[PDB]
Amino acid sequence: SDVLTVSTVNSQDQVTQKPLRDSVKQALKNYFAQLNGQDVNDLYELVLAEVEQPLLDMVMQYTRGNQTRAALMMGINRGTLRKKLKKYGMN
Amino acid sequence: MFEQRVNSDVLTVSTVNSQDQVTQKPLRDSVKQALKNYFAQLNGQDVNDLYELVLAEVEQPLLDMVMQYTRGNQTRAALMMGINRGTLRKKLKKYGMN
DNA sequence: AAATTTGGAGGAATTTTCTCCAAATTT
DNA sequence: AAATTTGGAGAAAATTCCTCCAAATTT
């Protein structure tokens, strides 16, 4: 039922999927824990960049550099894709 | 006195390595592996919503945590996320968290 | 009581999508 | 040679942000 999962291992060396949202959640819990009442300012751009970069990279790999197919897959505009690629210096 | 913390080591996840040691790896890698498994479990089908898929998959925990952190306070949450309060309410509604 | 938050307007600012085109590139 | 892709326009559609305001809630 969960299309986006990652692989985990337990103490008995058994491997098991878990939703990406669990990773995101753990990472954030850790983030909020490490800072002690320090102020957060741009958390959305932070995470969004942290997630957009490997996405673009993997979809660009899957379509062997074909931006149009990448854009079709992702469900965004070819221009938007171009913009995002520019943003993270992947061109 | 202050060691450089790279952007990729700001949001990290505990992992286990070939010497059974617990180490923090970037969230990037989690996203990368999830996507790699998604592609691998595709076997030639057409996709048209991958961005929305990932974005939902990532927005939901973010809103969950930021709402827990601010104790339900949408204004603080909006202020630390760096988005408008109306946008935040929109998103919260979208995922039934309002 | 005073300060802050909320829910929601109307409208401006920004972003994304759409429809082109011609040059470049792949097939 | 034919088909596809790329880069980039200008305009439409859509989303986000801004600026309020009275009621509701918290301090």
Q: Which of B31, B66, B82 sits opposite A54 (nearest CB)?
A: B31
Amino acid, res. B71: R
Nearest to A20, CA basis, from B33, B8, B65: B33
Indicate the SS3 state at residue B46: coil
Instruction: Report the C-alpha gap between B89 and B97 in whole angstroms.
Output: 9
Give whole-number Cα distances, B96 to A33, A67, A83, B8, B64, in Å: 26, 34, 31, 30, 11
Write down the CATH number for the domain with range B1-98.
1.10.10.60
Asked whether strand D has any atom less than 7 Å from the CB of A68, the reply is: yes
Instruction: Report the C-alpha gap between B59 and A16 in whole angstroms.
Output: 23
Domain A1-91 adopts which CATH fold? Arc Repressor Mutant, subunit A (1.10.10)
Nucleotide C15's nearest residue (CA vs C1') is A80
Give whole-number Cα distances, A72 to A75, B39, B48, in Å: 5, 15, 6
Q: Which of B31, B35, B80 sits opposite A41 (nearest CB)?
A: B80
Residue A85 forms contact with B (CB below 8 Å) = no
Asked whether strand C has any atom less than 7 Å from the CB of B33, the reply is: no
Nearest to B88, CA basis, from A12, B70, A13: B70
* Number of CB atoms found within 10 A of residue A70's CB: 23
Nearest to B38, CA basis, from A65, A17, A52: A17
Return the CA Rg of chain B.
17
Residue B30 forms contact with A (CB below 8 Å) = yes
Closest chain B residue to the Cα of A34, Cα to Cα: B10
